[PDB]
Amino acid sequence: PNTYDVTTWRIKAHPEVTAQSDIGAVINDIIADIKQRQTSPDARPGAAIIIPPGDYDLHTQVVVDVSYLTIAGFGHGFFSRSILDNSNPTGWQNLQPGASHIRVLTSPSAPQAFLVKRAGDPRLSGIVFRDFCLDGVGFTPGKNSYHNGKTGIEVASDNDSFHITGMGFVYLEHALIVRGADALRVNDNMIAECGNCVELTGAGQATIVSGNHMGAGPDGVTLLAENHEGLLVTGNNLFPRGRSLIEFTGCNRCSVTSNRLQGFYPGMLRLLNGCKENLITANHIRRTNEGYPPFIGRGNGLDDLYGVVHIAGDNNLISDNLFAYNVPPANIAPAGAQPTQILIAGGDANVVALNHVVSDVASQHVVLDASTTHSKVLDSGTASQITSYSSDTAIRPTP
Amino acid sequence: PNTYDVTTWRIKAHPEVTAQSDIGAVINDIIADIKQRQTSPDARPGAAIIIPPGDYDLHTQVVVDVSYLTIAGFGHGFFSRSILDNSNPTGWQNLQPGASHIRVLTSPSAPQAFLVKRAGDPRLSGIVFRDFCLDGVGFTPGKNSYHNGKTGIEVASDNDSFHITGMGFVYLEHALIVRGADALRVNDNMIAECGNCVELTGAGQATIVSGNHMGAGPDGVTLLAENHEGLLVTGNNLFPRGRSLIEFTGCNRCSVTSNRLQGFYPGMLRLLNGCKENLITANHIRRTNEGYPPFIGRGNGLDDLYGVVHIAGDNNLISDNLFAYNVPPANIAPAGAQPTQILIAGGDANVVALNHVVSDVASQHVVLDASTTHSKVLDSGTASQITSYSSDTAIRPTP
Amino acid sequence: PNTYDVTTWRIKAHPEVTAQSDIGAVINDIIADIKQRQTSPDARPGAAIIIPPGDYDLHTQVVVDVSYLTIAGFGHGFFSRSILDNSNPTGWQNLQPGASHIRVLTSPSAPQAFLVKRAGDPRLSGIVFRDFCLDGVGFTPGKNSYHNGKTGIEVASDNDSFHITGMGFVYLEHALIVRGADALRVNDNMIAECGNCVELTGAGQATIVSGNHMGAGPDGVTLLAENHEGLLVTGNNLFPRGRSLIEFTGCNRCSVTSNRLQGFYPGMLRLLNGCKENLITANHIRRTNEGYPPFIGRGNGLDDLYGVVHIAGDNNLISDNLFAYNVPPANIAPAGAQPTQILIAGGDANVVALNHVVSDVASQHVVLDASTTHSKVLDSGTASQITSYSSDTAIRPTP
Ligand SMILES: OC[C@H]1O[C@@](CO)(OC[C@@]2(O)O[C@H](CO)[C@@H](O)[C@@H]2O)[C@@H](O)[C@@H]1O
Ligand SMILES: OC[C@H]1O[C@@](CO)(OC[C@@]2(O)O[C@H](CO)[C@@H](O)[C@@H]2O)[C@@H](O)[C@@H]1O
Ligand SMILES: OC[C@H]1O[C@@](CO)(OC[C@@]2(O)O[C@H](CO)[C@@H](O)[C@@H]2O)[C@@H](O)[C@@H]1O
């Protein structure tokens, strides 16, 4: 009961339109049957749509408008399309992503493979997307452009208690987008080789983003949060080549702890447009130069004075972080300049303590811009590894 | 084999008693069939009971006495009954929780929907409860009382290697209770709008409580631990209105790290009755005033001198935490008093280092009561933001 | 489609060779059918093999050579064979592990129950092993030897995006082995009473090991990592009696944060053969004496001067950790010696800050060996709890 398998369900008016030819059409007809049956606001349990191991083409955008809908598969089936596209496929035993593999072949007018939204009142709640694969197939015009106008899963209406786990997102301009998230959970996923990985837009409350593997694109964000409060980002392994790896705009009282960050460009961790009272601690922050040839020479338009960690806001605590910076003197922007590990762009009362910096070149561990006030820097470098353009900055040298 | 679907299984002596009318009765008959079949202590693999998407009434308490029993569903189906009860339902498209929805309608004599217990020897092991929803339906006498005498899942006998994940608990006086837990795992769950969320009573060892979303009641605990050793509490997003958010009584060598805590009352983090050698670090602790009108004016009977974090024990390390305190001067208890972020009630050798406090009012970041001995306060406030009633306290100003 | 249940699938040439008698033979025939069917490198989605609740004997080693293969069960079914073997079984209601229980009865020539490997090009990707039980049955010659020459799951070829979750490993000389892991995920598992738990050999990239419960053997490792980069180890509860609990050899830029460590021997956390730029923070490290009689008197051949935490490498940051050391003066190796909490064996620029030590005996919180250069020790003990055999060590007393 209330359980469907995409491969056994026939579309009565269109019998040869299967999960293989258009799983999008198939899922929309299933959701139509769910609404068919559950007409009572007091009797709308939802349902589970299972996606068997296989290759499925999605031409028709799926509109999800039922609460507690679960779309699950048996695997994330990730496969590096990036390496395939930059390698010689001769004799290769695999040329594509697997598991419950959905190839997103959406039209411009309906970008998203899945678009969750509903009008009227109760906000959508309890929707779960798990253990299946969303593949954008390829990048266009350039094979390494990270552009293709497709989106995997997008939640456009305010949502409560959503759960996104065990997923596999690959080669999508936008993997996952969730606006107005509340008690959202994005954990144990593989989101990579996507222009953008996770975008929490609009605003948010007590959301959790942990245990995930992320890799974005030069012109995209890996993890982005807009006007969020209570966001916990922990135990994620964010690797190369978003424009940033963690980017908060105007979020307050959030926490970024126990994470692994690896970027090839300036501003891997950004706190923009007045982020207040956030905790950034116990994170490994490694900045280095792009190591995979196909992408050598690409950038995010930022120079090394932007800082690996960029803070614009008040009362944020950046501590107990390990900075490993290895970048060719010649790749350092501007010529002659000392790389900035932590830049306090503006704001009041920011505190920077116990941050170990390791770098191949002379670097300013912490820089407090002339706009900053009442900042505090403790055990984050010697006096000559710290530049304070403010005169009310309190500094304590690492002995 | 050894797999049942609650909707297809008929109770031989009682044919019209279905999962819909009494899933409790159904599950008990299934467990009876399991014991029927597995009579050999050397041949007792257990089984899996699947709960299809749907609305199910539970009148009869389920007694779980077989090891390695797995009761799974397809979703946590959380839905804010609290907001429904305090809003105008007209035209609402949903009035109830979904997914594998079990409405707990238990009788006083058998409170618990699920009661796991067994006599004799081997302790019960490997029991798994996952991906389904337990809903207490409503609160009684007051719709906002958080009282109703029902319990979701309770483990009364010593257990080994239990696993509780992907669940949905809502409107239950007691969501989850586990006595004598050993190598227990409570992760990736949504437990909210419950009088009490997770109660680890009796005693415990090497337990993990992480990646969970929890919100309790004024007269209840969010996460409670009794005489636990090796407890790890990490990556949880604990929000509003337990009497406390984390409460340990006599636990030793446990760890509370990388969490998001948000409370509306004093003592959000409590270490009572001599807790020794525990690590409380890298947590975001925010205390503020109740923000949802229906509950404005409710309390936990504690004043602001109890401290947001209350410690009674020895050698505990409270460090690298960010305290965000925003409370109306007029709501501050006692009139004229300065709020206490960290109170070291009693104990020896407690260490408080690198704790950033942000508050709208003059506040004592750390207070060491006259009973305390050999305490140490480092980089947690200026000398005037610290009150030591002891004389062996070692203090170092945040420059 | 592409979904098999091990109990319904007959081996055409060998009809009575069931999952019960040789699930190994069964799975190999299933994989043979998958390869039968998916001959196109462009059409190799993989499949899912489901293992129903039950007792299954594995005599034949399973060779997994298809990408995106998912082998899943309904439970980890852990059961302490150690306690059974050292107790009186009379009247016991369980004598063995449950859930989707696979008893590994492999022959010397094919140790591993599951051996994942493939020749040629694309590296194997997206393979998932979840929610089932691997039991080695017993230890041989000694019942408490932790030796039996069996291995549970071993990945010998370079792999990408593997996922190992919800598993149960018990009584195996080697539970899990994964060479050349990339974006690997080992989370939410129960690996205990195994000679060795998790072995990441060869080399690795951006791997995550979190939310796991581990206990190894005196002659084995709990978590081992070889030449790994970007390894994140977080939220794990590692308990008693590996020779070590976390052991890295030549890993760089990895992070071990927010973990619970409990050992009975020296060197619970080891950074060997030049590990550079690693973050070890926010961990609870408890060293004490073996508490279960059957194992009293056993050891790992290391003395108390090796240190509970042993570091040999450069620029590592060991901070915000809580050390609880309780060991009988008489069990302390060498007689008369002061236990070493943190030993910096050799290396340049290591930083040790904010580490709280609690011990029943006079102990050297930090020892910097004469080989070390430019080390830093802050707030990790008084000058007399710190031994620096170097002269360029910068030290700052815990006031
Ligand atoms: O930088 C990681 C980035 O590159 C990809 C290839 O486009 O992975 C390639 C690889 O070699 O990079 C890391 C190594 O540093 C390793 O894990 C990879 O397997 C890509 O998907 C990533 O986004
Ligand atoms: O304080 C959280 C508490 O209130 C509930 C309503 O009873 O959620 C309401 C809500 O508005 O509170 C938070 C914002 O502060 C937000 O996530 C909610 O959606 C409830 O379940 C919580 O226990
Ligand atoms: O030290 C843990 C070790 O011992 C076992 C028994 O061989 O567990 C026994 C037990 O008593 O140890 C811890 C307590 O200290 C507790 O969780 C156990 O249940 C074993 O599996 C462990 O590896």
Side-chain angles (χ1 to χ4, degrees), chain B residues 174-216:
Chain B
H174 297 268
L176 174 70
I177 295 173
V178 187
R179 192 154 204 116
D182 181 10
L184 163 74
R185 257 179 299 151
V186 176
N187 69 297
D188 206 21
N189 308 277
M190 169 61 154
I191 319 173
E193 291 183 15
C194 285
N196 303 78
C197 297
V198 175
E199 298 168 74
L200 311 179
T201 64
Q205 242 115 67
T207 296
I208 297 175
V209 174
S210 69
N212 305 286
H213 270 298
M214 290 178 219

Side-chain angles (χ1 to χ4, degrees), chain B residues 304-305 325 332-334 336-340 361-365 367 384-385:
Chain B
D304 290 276
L305 289 175
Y325 182 106
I332 298 175
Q338 272 200 41
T340 295
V361 295
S363 161
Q364 280 315 100
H365 299 193
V367 175
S384 66
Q385 295 172 316

Side-chain angles (χ1 to χ4, degrees), chain A residues 34-367:
Chain A
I34 294 174
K35 296 197 275 186
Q36 186 78 266
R37 300 180 304 93
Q38 313 178 184
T39 54
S40 180
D42 203 45
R44 285 204 273 220
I49 301 179
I50 303 305
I51 301 170
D55 291 326
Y56 311 98
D57 278 359
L58 188 139
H59 283 278
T60 304
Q61 169 192 78
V62 181
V63 171
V64 177
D65 63 331
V66 54
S67 286
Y68 328 116
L69 210 226
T70 286
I71 297 171
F74 296 77
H76 64 292
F78 178 87
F79 167 93
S80 180
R81 273 186 175 286
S82 188
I83 295 174
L84 168 68
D85 277 327
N86 290 291
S87 298
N88 182 351
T90 307
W92 271 40
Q93 300 168 76
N94 292 282
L95 305 167
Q96 282 192 63
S100 309
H101 178 48
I102 287 180
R103 297 155 48 78
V104 178
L105 307 171
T106 49
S107 68
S109 40
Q112 320 95 326
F114 294 93
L115 181 58
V116 189
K117 64 178 182 173
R118 192 176 64 183
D121 282 309
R123 305 171 283 175
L124 286 163
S125 45
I127 293 173
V128 184
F129 279 103
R130 72 187 298 175
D131 311 305
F132 74 89
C133 176
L134 285 171
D135 167 26
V137 183
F139 287 134
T140 297
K143 67 181 178 184
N144 296 316
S145 73
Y146 278 95
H147 282 75
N148 62 20
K150 298 158 173 195
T151 296
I153 293 172
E154 166 158 21
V155 178
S157 311
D158 293 346
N159 50 99
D160 189 36
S161 210
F162 272 32
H163 198 359
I164 303 296
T165 182
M167 301 277 297
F169 293 95
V170 62
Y171 258 46
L172 286 167
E173 198 171 323
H174 297 269
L176 176 71
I177 295 174
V178 183
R179 194 164 202 103
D182 178 17
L184 166 72
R185 261 179 300 157
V186 175
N187 68 302
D188 207 18
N189 309 277
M190 168 63 73
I191 325 177
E193 286 182 21
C194 287
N196 305 75
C197 299
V198 178
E199 294 169 83
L200 312 177
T201 58
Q205 299 290 328
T207 289
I208 299 178
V209 175
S210 72
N212 307 285
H213 271 296
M214 248 150 44
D219 301 320
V221 299
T222 314
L223 174 60
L224 162 65
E226 303 186 342
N227 315 302
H228 262 248
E229 163 98 18
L231 179 58
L232 225 198
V233 183
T234 69
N236 297 282
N237 196 306
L238 321 177
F239 43 78
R241 63 184 41 94
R243 69 192 192 202
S244 58
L245 299 181
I246 289 175
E247 196 180 311
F248 292 172
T249 166
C251 304
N252 301 307
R253 297 120 206 152
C254 304
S255 174
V256 177
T257 310
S258 304
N259 296 287
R260 185 277 177 135
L261 279 62
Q262 195 196 200
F264 296 146
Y265 328 116
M268 276 152 56
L269 211 160
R270 306 188 209 180
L271 250 60
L272 318 165
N273 310 146
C275 292
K276 297 186 303 290
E277 303 151 36
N278 304 282
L279 175 67
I280 313 283
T281 193
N283 296 287
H284 188 105
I285 312 170
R286 145 62 128 214
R287 165 62 216 294
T288 192
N289 53 307
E290 166 67 72
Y292 189 51
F295 294 96
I296 291 177
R298 206 98 110 71
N300 66 346
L302 292 180
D303 67 42
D304 290 276
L305 288 171
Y306 190 79
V308 180
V309 170
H310 190 284
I311 311 291
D314 317 313
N315 280 293
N316 300 290
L317 171 67
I318 306 85
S319 58
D320 194 42
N321 295 301
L322 197 173
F323 292 75
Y325 182 105
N326 187 299
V327 177
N331 295 326
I332 298 173
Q338 272 198 43
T340 298
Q341 295 315 312
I342 297 168
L343 171 64
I344 304 301
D348 180 62
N350 292 289
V351 178
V352 176
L354 196 58
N355 289 286
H356 186 226
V357 172
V358 186
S359 54
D360 64 311
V361 297
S363 163
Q364 282 311 104
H365 300 192
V366 189
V367 173

Side-chain angles (χ1 to χ4, degrees), chain C residues 96-227:
Chain C
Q96 287 190 65
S100 312
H101 180 45
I102 288 181
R103 321 212 308 150
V104 181
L105 308 169
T106 50
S107 300
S109 50
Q112 319 96 326
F114 293 91
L115 181 56
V116 187
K117 61 178 183 173
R118 190 176 66 183
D121 290 324
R123 297 173 286 174
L124 282 164
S125 191
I127 297 178
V128 183
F129 279 99
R130 72 187 297 177
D131 309 308
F132 74 88
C133 180
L134 283 173
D135 167 21
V137 183
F139 286 136
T140 39
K143 69 178 172 189
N144 295 319
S145 76
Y146 278 94
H147 280 79
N148 65 20
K150 296 159 180 193
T151 297
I153 293 173
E154 165 158 25
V155 178
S157 310
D158 296 346
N159 49 99
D160 190 33
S161 207
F162 272 29
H163 197 0
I164 303 297
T165 184
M167 306 266 316
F169 293 91
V170 62
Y171 258 44
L172 289 166
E173 198 170 320
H174 297 270
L176 175 75
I177 294 176
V178 185
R179 194 165 201 103
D182 179 18
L184 165 72
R185 258 176 301 157
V186 176
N187 72 296
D188 208 20
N189 309 276
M190 170 59 80
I191 320 172
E193 294 185 7
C194 283
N196 302 73
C197 297
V198 177
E199 294 172 81
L200 313 176
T201 59
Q205 303 281 157
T207 295
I208 296 175
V209 181
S210 69
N212 306 284
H213 271 293
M214 298 183 223
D219 297 314
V221 296
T222 306
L223 173 62
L224 164 61
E226 302 185 342
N227 314 303

